[PDB]
Amino acid sequence: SAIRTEPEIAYRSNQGVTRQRQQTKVFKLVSTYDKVAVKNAIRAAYRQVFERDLEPYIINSEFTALESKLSNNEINVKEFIEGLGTSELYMKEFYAPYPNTKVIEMGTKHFLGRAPLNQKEIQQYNQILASQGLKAFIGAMVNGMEYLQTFGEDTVPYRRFPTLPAANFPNTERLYNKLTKQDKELVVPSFTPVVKVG
Amino acid sequence: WQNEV
Amino acid sequence: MQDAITAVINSADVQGKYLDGAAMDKLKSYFASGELRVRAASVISANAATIVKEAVAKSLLYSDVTRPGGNMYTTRRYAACIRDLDYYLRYATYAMLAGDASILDERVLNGLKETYNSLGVPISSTVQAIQAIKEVTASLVGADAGKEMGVYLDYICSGLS
Amino acid sequence: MQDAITAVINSADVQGKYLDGAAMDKLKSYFASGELRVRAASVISANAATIVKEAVAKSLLYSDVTRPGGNMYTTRRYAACIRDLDYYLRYATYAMLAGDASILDERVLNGLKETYNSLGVPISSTVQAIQAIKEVTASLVGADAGKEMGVYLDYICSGLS
Amino acid sequence: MQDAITAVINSADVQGKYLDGAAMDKLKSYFASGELRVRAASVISANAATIVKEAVAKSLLYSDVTRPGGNMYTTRRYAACIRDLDYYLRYATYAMLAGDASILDERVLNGLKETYNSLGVPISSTVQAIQAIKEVTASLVGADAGKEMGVYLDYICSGLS
Amino acid sequence: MQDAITAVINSADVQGKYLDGAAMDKLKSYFASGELRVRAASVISANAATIVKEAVAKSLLYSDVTRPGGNMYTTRRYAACIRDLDYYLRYATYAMLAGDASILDERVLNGLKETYNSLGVPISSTVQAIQAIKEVTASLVGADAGKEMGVYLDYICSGLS
């Protein structure tokens, strides 16, 4: 029905979920003998964790030992991502200029690929951040069950498009539609409890 | 032995 | 989340005392209703594909959204709308079994209007799909058992509006 | 993201009709321009760093932005600016391959305005740096391929303005 | 990995010399074989699934492996075994089209012995299955291309043995 | 990892008493050596590229190892060898500052021997590279600091050997 004018054509061509869900590459280290594929997976891991190529943020490559171990296949891509999280560049970049709630947001976005699920998850990651800090926070996120069921040990993490639970997809979209250091306010400050327990 | 209350 | 019984417990804990006689009366009213809630939940869980099938058939097919260019077009988006209505029916069954409409704004309506506004999802078409859901459910489980389903599906409509 | 071909396909999909003669001769125009786009891609991919080098040399070297107080001062900010021009050149090459500016719309210009406003990045100097990239690649790859690269870089300029 | 072409290039590169007439003869031999390699691989890609169907029909069905108590018992393990047959057929096609069996001991044979020993996978039944694929492909694609596939399939058998 | 101080502490804790006279002598020896360790570490970190540069120049360059056929042929392998030598020099300086080689065989010697045997790396050529590093560092830092660097470099030679 109707005539479907050109602004309506442009609107309804990109209607629902954005086409970046299908128009991406999933980086899996299928074999460690193809050194070009290993280097591509390593640079994709850099782009996923630090959101950019880390050429204007380093002096020399601090993770060259991690690259050598990943090429030697004595660590996995999961341990490579663990080292990138528990590196000095990550605490310089996404921990030093942001509060711990924003650290939880950025860590979930970089490593789990999505926004934090619930207030229980936020309180949990705040407990690890208060007790042992960023290293055990990255360790808990990487060695958690959700990371292994989603990516596994051989896959670089990527941007996710979840359906469940509530608000996870809009908060993930608000996290992933802004560039690096675009804003300093909180995408997910906290989930407001509809029931004030106690 | 102070043992203050 | 919360149900009627933990709503009684939380209302006791806000004022800080124990459970008085009116709290026991509300609990016994919930225990009286619980047989009907369990029976209705079993019927809806058994027939849950048929409710959403007949509801989409009577409210969503042969419309502007179903014609090409619309939101119901593109079978991926079509099955996603079916999955959304399945989620609405399942969480409405959760709310009917619970006795409190806290699970809707704790697990469904949290950011749902923002989701559909960013997604270009027709709000009134979703609302009339929910109306078809509650009409089919009230026709299936009866008027008295369908009353609570009407409460929670209309709560979804009021939250999403 | 969509190129010219899938942009035609998606437009006809929303129109709900098959490919009429406008779709066919737009597709023939893209198939005519494809060899030119491939050759310009090879030239720009060969001279990716040197185009940025001569563009930043003839646009913003020995100026107030490179002076202390300017935003290209310090090696961190300078290398960030060089990576920004590399991003602009690579995504302009992507849009020149596609025949569409959707990649610039969703992967470049999305949030870039308020990102640069939060960072204090000089918009006019960035625009004339992109203009310098336009002149260098127009002198390098030819007149017509340089004209398509110029109109995509000017689309980046208009989105950033 | 490496094919015959990369093997020729590496055999030149280990002494660091340019290509000579022997390398030209090897490359022309590979270009002569490329016709039957392309035709055979196109045939395998066209009818890959029915080859696995007849191979598992004449190798593993109605046997002690697919009976209860066998390792091909349960639908999960049956689908895993036929998925392994799909893997072996696809990598045999890759090794046939490449002309060198480097992908087999790079991406199939490494860790497979220990994995099958830890999971209790029957090596002899797997080798009999690979024999079923090699006679089915020999009967289906021709004599020379069939035995060329059978060379790398027997290489997979020797790696599993 | 145990340095001199924590090695004395761990040897005190394995039998559960305080610091005896031998602990006093070892701690006083490390106290005396520490200024020389700081000066040697400062001199090495001043010119850390230079030992690697003329060590490869006087030991590995213009030989069959960097000629085709050798293991330092191709740029990836050459950069790997340079990165390995920088690793060995940095961890030798680290063991020099610590006063014990527990960090050395805990951090750099993890699987290096079987890694190099799997990769075909020449252990003798690596040893000669470490010898060149020893001579250049002995020229740089002096005689006594040079030989107590060279004992840890010889421990690296034993780790590969």
Added chain:
Amino acid sequence: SIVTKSIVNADAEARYLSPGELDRIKAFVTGGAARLRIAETLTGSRETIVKQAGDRLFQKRPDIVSPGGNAYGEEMTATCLRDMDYYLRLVTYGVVSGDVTPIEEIGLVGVREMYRSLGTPIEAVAQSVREMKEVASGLMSSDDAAEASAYFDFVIGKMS
């Protein structure tokens, strides 16, 4: 399109396009003329394809147009023919785009769940697409029949 795939791969790897990818784009461009010829043939022969394929489909499966079937009424038979017109339009889109990407993105994700919710026999829809393939190969030249039947067999495989 393969241009879209190459740009996506290059953007994910954060690099420019490889010469192999550029030669692939060149080959796609050179085959574009024959692909548009096949698309124009199918677009010109639009209505007779769905008419003859629907007639042969109802000959082979009379139960779907029998009373009590999913496609008994005239409106339901028109909805069947509209679905076949949809899939023919997607097949022409795939022939133009040189890949199965627009067909898979528009009308092949969740098709099983859609037709299960509608009560529609998915094997009979696949049989219908097979009849469309047979009529297309009947009225179109043999190499063009092979190129169109690639996408047709993709649709049949995703349905089955």
Added chain:
Amino acid sequence: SIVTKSIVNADAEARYLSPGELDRIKAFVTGGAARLRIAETLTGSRETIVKQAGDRLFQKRPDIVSPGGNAYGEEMTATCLRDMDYYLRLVTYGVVSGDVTPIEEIGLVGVREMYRSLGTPIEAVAQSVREMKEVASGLMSSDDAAEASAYFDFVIGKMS
């Protein structure tokens, strides 16, 4: 609430409630009269149970009311018995709910660092709630003692 727990498990598994969970909710809403009776019993007799519990606690563990203790004088002794009243009303809440979740998210999460910050002996609080379980088992019927002792055992297990 066991209804809340079953809905949470069904939501985590992304499904409707199983017939076993439905039968558990039905059995709970039929058998809730005994839980109502035990709630009325403990609410009416709230005084003497915590009287005898605190008394026997102080006669077996006098280090609290020793000088230098956390509750030496009667003021923090009154706050200690107020803590005991809090734990008893949470036990009644668990009894009416049928599941230990309201006990858990009101007063059982973080009690470790709570009582390291307040200096109270965790094992002494656990022994006090164990003595509550003893005097409640003395006060009520044997099956009623077992069903209240389930929640008492949960509280002492997660405290200790």
Added chain:
Amino acid sequence: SIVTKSIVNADAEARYLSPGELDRIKAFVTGGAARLRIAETLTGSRETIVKQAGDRLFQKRPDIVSPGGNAYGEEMTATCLRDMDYYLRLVTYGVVSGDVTPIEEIGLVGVREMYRSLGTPIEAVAQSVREMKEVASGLMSSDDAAEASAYFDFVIGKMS
């Protein structure tokens, strides 16, 4: 050691030590003789430290050694003073190390869970090491008692 902390930081940032860190090592290997002298004085006069600190700890908190308690009895006070000797030896290890990481990896990792399983008040052990640093500053020189109180200060902070 402080060389271990500096070398861990330098390995984490994946290059040689910054001259701030070589300044750390230089001033440590100038002051190591003084640190060793302080630790030798504490080692020589260790017995009066543990004995007087335990006596004034029992004076400050008599609830700990009251009957029924954790430390009640000559046996339990012997084990408690053995813990006091353990902690004093660990602080001397920290003094000779130049940092607090041997203190952490011997006695401060899992100490809260240790004393929760043992039923030992960590606030009372914190008061115990407060009296440790009081007696040590009483019988130690003031500039020496500055660094001794700094390392006891870390023990109080991490264990309290």
Added chain:
Amino acid sequence: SIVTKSIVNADAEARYLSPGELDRIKAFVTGGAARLRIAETLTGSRETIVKQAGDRLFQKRPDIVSPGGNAYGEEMTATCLRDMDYYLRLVTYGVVSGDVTPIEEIGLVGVREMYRSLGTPIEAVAQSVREMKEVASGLMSSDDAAEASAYFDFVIGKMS
């Protein structure tokens, strides 16, 4: 080789080596006579083009042959010509392979770190490859030079 690249791209997304790359493999194995002619032309005239390329390289950047430069001494200049001969042989390997992955595997991974350690200007190495490309384009016949230009431009693009 292009067959190796097609196998890798098919294996990455688990395909069966589609006709969209198999026709390219067919075109490569039919048209390999032209690229073998290119390779034997470059092998026959390998010394003249590398000497003229070194001539134009020293014409544009005589820093390296200056006494402070890296290529100074007539032995390091010989090493310059030797490295340029190495890259010419890599270009011939690429033009017989059909793609860029043998040049990538042999001489482009870690070349930045290599020339950083050697102190040579990698931009001048890229300029040398540019002059080698220009001399080979002048020596070769039009479309053959354009075919080799993809491999050359890959070497300059990954070098810079």
Added chain:
Amino acid sequence: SIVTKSIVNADAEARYLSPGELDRIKAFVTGGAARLRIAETLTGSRETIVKQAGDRLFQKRPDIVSPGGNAYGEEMTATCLRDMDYYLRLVTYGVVSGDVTPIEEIGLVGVREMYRSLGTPIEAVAQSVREMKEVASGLMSSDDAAEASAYFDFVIGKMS
């Protein structure tokens, strides 16, 4: 600054500053006056130190100022001396701050990307600031030359 690097380390490790680290900010604030003396003598003698450093670089590496060079011109030598003075400013900022943090935050992060965009030899600018070190050791007092030349050793090791 040393305080800001230590406090970033403590903030990441989720703890207060270690007493060794407080002792070392204590050492830095006691010994800070000599650092101010280094800063004021470098500010006083900035022009002659950069004169001698630039002149001896132009003696040692004539390829830098040779025709074809990046620093061939009179202009190009002037902006080379600009970079020289910039790194002198960074060394003064570092000796004031007591750590390598302003040098790395202003003039080392991304400097390889900048200098490969400009084509300048990073080993040559490292040689330049090494010559600043040696003339600073010649011109300035021997005891403070340890700290100043050490921070120079940091920047030459991080840059080369």
